[PDB]
Amino acid sequence: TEFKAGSAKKGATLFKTRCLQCHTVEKGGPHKVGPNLHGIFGRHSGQAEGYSYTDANIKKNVLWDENNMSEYLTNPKKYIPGTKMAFGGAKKEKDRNDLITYLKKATE
């Protein structure tokens, strides 16, 4: 929509340096600070099982699609006020396109 495909390899590294500390993407992957992200796109916010989400996350009932994920990736707390994700944000569209491209591919 207002999301353009980017570098999958570029995104894989962004993930390692900004997301891996708290999340996993593989199927059969374990939750850590952050919930496992396999099958995220199309799922609504706060539905992974065996993971303890904030009230904030649950109640947004965000349908993850490349578009929304881009909003959220800019500034998680402004997007979902109350959330415990301590990620400052990805101000760069290019950075986000790359990431979501990556996520798009490795979370399926």
Q: Which of 3, 12, 34, 64 binds a copy of itself (CB under 8 A)?
A: 12
The residues that bridge with 44 in the sheet, in sequence order, are 63
31 is in an annotated binding site: no
| Smallest separation, CB 82 to a copy of itself (Å) | 31
Q: Environment class of residue 50 by beta-carbon count within 10 Å: exposed (0-12), middle (13-18) or buried (19+)?
A: exposed
Chain centre distance of CA 31:
13
Q: How far is the CB of 33 from a copy of itself (least distance, A)?
A: 21
Q: Rank residues 13 and 75 by Cβ distance to a copy of itself and give the closer one.
A: 13
